[PDB]
């Protein structure tokens, strides 16, 4: 049995990876953070690991021995550090774990807070949406200069803010009439509910076959542009939308005087629907998660989108 | 089949009452509200209670119409609106609810946001604390002055904000190696898991000998000293702890200089644990939800820091 740790356990993705490492077997530990107070949530989701076979773990990021005492327990660390401006942006966070597994030195292996656009490829990215592969860049950095052995996950948007919203942004849910089309809407666009990046991740963070490697989730059903995605809706529905669509100037018209994550955000999608950031390469068959591990019966866009009916 | 709506449905109670109304088997409505934007937890718990059988029903608070059409639909509306400083304290919006199922007129019961202390009993309360009552009470006047016929549950303290942390103040977990004790730890109080609860106000929201009535839940075997809380979780743990008694005026002492949310937490636990509000009158098995269903085998507080072991 491989012994995890989840850093970040209580997160979005992350409370997902620790039951999908709990589901794959794994011996699943989770960081519990002191300064928890009364944020209810939180620990109720770790007395829900609990009860599942999860192994709590008490360690802060400000008590350094603390994190060094943590990671000694297990074989993996994977983090889930916050990184979207309108949550919170932590990623740089994660350098004081890093140092702890420097110290601590029985680490086979560390997957950082990835999870979306492959850092390295967006050194052309518009600020301050640069920050997230800037920080999570510094944090590769570290990891290498550390001789940490790591798998990176990346390749996907989450389902839920970009599949479930028809890609309208800031909103969650698909609109009742209009929707905007961001260019033609033929741009290749990669879809994963979260759960299945979670599955992949717990199946890859011990595979010898992705030791040092970027893994790529990148489902061949789900790479979608934003017009099939819309066109999934329009059959379940039988109603066609408005669409209206929106040129790369227009959509991008005084972001300078938006609120600062919304500048983020509008640069993201912009690399992902205009860009095509996630479309625009290829990657081979022995680095995508969908052909490593074909046992995971991803969820494809048609059945995801059915929850919104 | 009795139609129940449920307003604040992805509340902390609200949405362990909305699976509850439909365990129960209650045709059961939750009101999803417009403003949600990006706030995915939300969103995802209404597709989980879609998931579950719950339908929903789209209204608003500022739009007067919205929720007379949204309680046209049932036959009782269940509000567990916000009532806590330190999160949101929202009890008087209600108001507009009460407005609202008047102008209807079909509604066969309205269970307001009750949940806690007595408020028709808390005219001593020490504000900021006492707001909690004078608005819960604004809500009884109004309901009772349109005659819409009601259920006011009341008597428990949660048992997560009381219980799992030994009701130590600004901590949801047992504590390591000291406690505090109020007084000398020998008042009463009634402490309740908060599933209980909502079965409880699902089991009660159609029952005839509870309509127009203040229904308590104050389960035997829940009625606890603090003390008595504490050697629970020492005999589970098999350490003691040592104690520190604080007295009445200490404990109290410059109340009028810290955060008005802290003021009212310290009010409230001084009437619950020094006072004894939940204890110092008894009430009758006709008016006592354990004994009114007793095929609810509620969870003991040994039982319940089980959990946190
Ligand atoms: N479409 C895509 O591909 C998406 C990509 N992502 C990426 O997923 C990754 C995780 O993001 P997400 O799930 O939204 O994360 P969250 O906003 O849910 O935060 C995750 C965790 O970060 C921990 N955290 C935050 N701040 C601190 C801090 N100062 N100190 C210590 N811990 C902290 C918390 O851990 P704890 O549980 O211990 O409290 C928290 O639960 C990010 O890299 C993000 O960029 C995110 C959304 C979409
Ligand atoms: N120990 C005890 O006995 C305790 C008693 N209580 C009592 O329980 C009741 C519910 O409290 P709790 O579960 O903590 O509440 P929450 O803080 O979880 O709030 C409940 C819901 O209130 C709705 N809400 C908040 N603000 C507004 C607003 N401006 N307009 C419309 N709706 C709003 C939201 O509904 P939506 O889902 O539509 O977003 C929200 O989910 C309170 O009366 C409280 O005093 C609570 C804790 C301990
Ligand atoms: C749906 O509306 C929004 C949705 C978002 C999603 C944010 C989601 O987490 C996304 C994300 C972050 C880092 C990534 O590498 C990524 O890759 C797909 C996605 C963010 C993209 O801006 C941001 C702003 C919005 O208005
Ligand atoms: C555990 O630490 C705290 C716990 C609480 C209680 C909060 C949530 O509601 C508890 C409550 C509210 C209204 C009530 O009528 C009630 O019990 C009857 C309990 C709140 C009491 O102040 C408050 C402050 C704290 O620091």
Redo the contacts with the bound molecule.
């Keep these: 049995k491989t012994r995890v740790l989840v850093?970040?356990?209580?997160?979005?993705?992350?409370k997902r990876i620790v039951r999908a490492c709990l589901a794959e077997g794994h011996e699943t530990y989770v960081?519990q953070?002191p300064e928890?107070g009364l944020e209810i949530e939180?620990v109720q989701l770790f007395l829900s690991f609990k009860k599942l076979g999860a192994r709590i773990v008490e360690g802060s990021?400000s008590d350094h021995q603390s994190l060094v005492s943590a990671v000694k327990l297990v074989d993996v660390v994977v983090s889930?550090?916050?990184?979207?401006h309108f949550?919170?942006h932590?990623?740089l966070?994660q350098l004081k774990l890093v140092e702890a597994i420097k110290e601590a030195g029985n680490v086979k292996r560390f997957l950082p807070?990835?999870?979306?656009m492959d850092p390295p490829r967006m050194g052309h990215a518009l600020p301050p949406g640069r920050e997230?592969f800037d920080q999570?860049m510094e944090v590769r950095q570290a990891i290498e200069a550390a001789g940490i052995p790591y798998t990176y996950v990346v390749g996907?948007?989450?389902a839920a803010?970009?599949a479930g919203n028809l890609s309208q942004m800031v909103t969650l849910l698909p609109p009742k009439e209009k929707v905007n089309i961001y260019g033609d809407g033929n741009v290749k666009v990669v879809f994963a509910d979260e759960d299945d990046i979670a599955k992949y991740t717990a199946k890859t963070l011990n595979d010898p076959r992705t030791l040092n490697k970027t893994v790529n989730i990148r489902p061949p059903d789900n790479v979608l542009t934003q017009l099939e995605l819309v066109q999934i809706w329009e059959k379940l529905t039988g109603k066609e939308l408005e669409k209206t669509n929106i040129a790369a100037q227009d959509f991008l018209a005084n972001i300078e005087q938006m609120e600062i994550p919304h500048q983020a955000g509008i640069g993201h999608f912009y690399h992902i629907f205009y860009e095509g950031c996630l479309t625009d390469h290829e990657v081979g068959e022995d680095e995508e998660a969908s052909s490593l591990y074909p046992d995971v019966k991803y969820k494809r866009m048609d059945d995801y989108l059915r929850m919104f009916l």
């Design positions: 850093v970040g356990a209580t997160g979005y993705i992350g960081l953070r928890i939180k990021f889930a550090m916050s990184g979207v949550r919170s932590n990623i966070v807070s990835e999870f979306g997230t999570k996907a948007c989450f803010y970009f």
